[PDB]
A paper describes a structure:
Several TCRs have been isolated from TILs of epithelial cancer patients that recognize a neoepitope corresponding to residues 168–176 of p53R175H. The structures reveal how oligoclonal TCRs 12-6, 38-10, and 1a2 discriminate between wild-type and mutated [name], and demonstrate that there are multiple distinct solutions to recognizing the p53R175H neoepitope with sufficient affinity to mediate tumor cell killing.
In both [name]–[name]-A2 and p53R175H–[name]-A2, the peptide is bound in conventional orientation with the side chains of P2 Met and P9 Cys accommodated in pockets B and F, respectively, in the peptide-binding groove. The root-mean-square difference (r.m.s.d.) for α-carbon atoms in the peptide chains is 0.18 Å, while for all atoms, excluding the P8 Arg and His side chains, it is 0.45 Å.
Author numbering:
A (entry chain P): 1 to 9
B (entry chain A): 1 to 275
C (entry chain B): 1 to 100
The structure:
Amino acid sequence: HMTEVVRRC
Amino acid sequence: GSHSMRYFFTSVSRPGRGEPRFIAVGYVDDTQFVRFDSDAASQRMEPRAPWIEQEGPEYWDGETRKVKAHSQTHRVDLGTLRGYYNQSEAGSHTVQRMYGCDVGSDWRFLRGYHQYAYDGKDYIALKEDLRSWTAADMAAQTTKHKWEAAHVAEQLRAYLEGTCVEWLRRYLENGKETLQRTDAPKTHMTHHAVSDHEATLRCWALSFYPAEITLTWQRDGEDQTQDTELVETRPAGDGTFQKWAAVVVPSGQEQRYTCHVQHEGLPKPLTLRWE
Amino acid sequence: MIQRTPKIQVYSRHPAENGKSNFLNCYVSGFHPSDIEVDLLKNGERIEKVEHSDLSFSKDWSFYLLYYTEFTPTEKDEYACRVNHVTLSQPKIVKWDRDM
């Protein structure tokens, strides 16, 4: 189960 | 024992040769259960262990939606990083991300991780309190400031302390027959003469699970490291692991030497002597 | 940009017996960047049907990959693995060795 967090650098 | 889940993400830019290659891979302890390959046909998250097939369509649809969003963000980062580092568009560069959680024997949260690397070196990670960031250099300060602004730590902590461990548990139950096994090493020694003066002893550990193992040589009951050789634990390709250690000894002196093998599969550590 | 040269190990899945089907392994680790070139060789000839693992990496961020193929070994037939990587000045070759 991956995280929802995909914030950009 | 203790257990863990880990995800491993790699994006590689290829200038003039299209969009970034992106590979994602999911792990419980030392068993791979999930994968995505941007250059495969399915364009879906795909199972790699039998027990994950117990998951329904909403899972596969949720994981694919996510792995694609991860790929989209790595596609943007490769561009962003290039700016932060003032690099040209000609070279190839690599973004790596790793995250997941550790639970102890009681399957409760011990530790969580979330780290990023640019071209082979730390870029930004989440500190062990899961509430602040360590920027490896001055460029990573720009990122840290953006994620502090958008409250990313808090969202990742919720993941790492709850969601991660809840699903880690569920996997361990669902795949109990594999994930909770122990395969003890099948062990043996070999002898090979280098000349009239010296021989190589090689102590083998084969077919063990999990992968964590120690091999250590002793001479007459004392630790011996000089004139030894240890390979990296390697996969067998059937879900078990292999490893060996060697020592170069004076011909006629073999008997002084013991090989000592610790593994979760050995209640009592093994001693091997050539004799 | 940090670059590391791969380690190479050639070996079999199970203890090798003549006339028993097996797997030939080429495990490459601790390298960066990810692009690498592995081929399995039979008497110096490139085998065709060769699978490999999904790329992953270690605590230090170096890559690792398992290259594998079905085969039935024999007295005569020699096997090697061929590797090329930006850190190599020329492709490396490592022969399989039955005892070690």
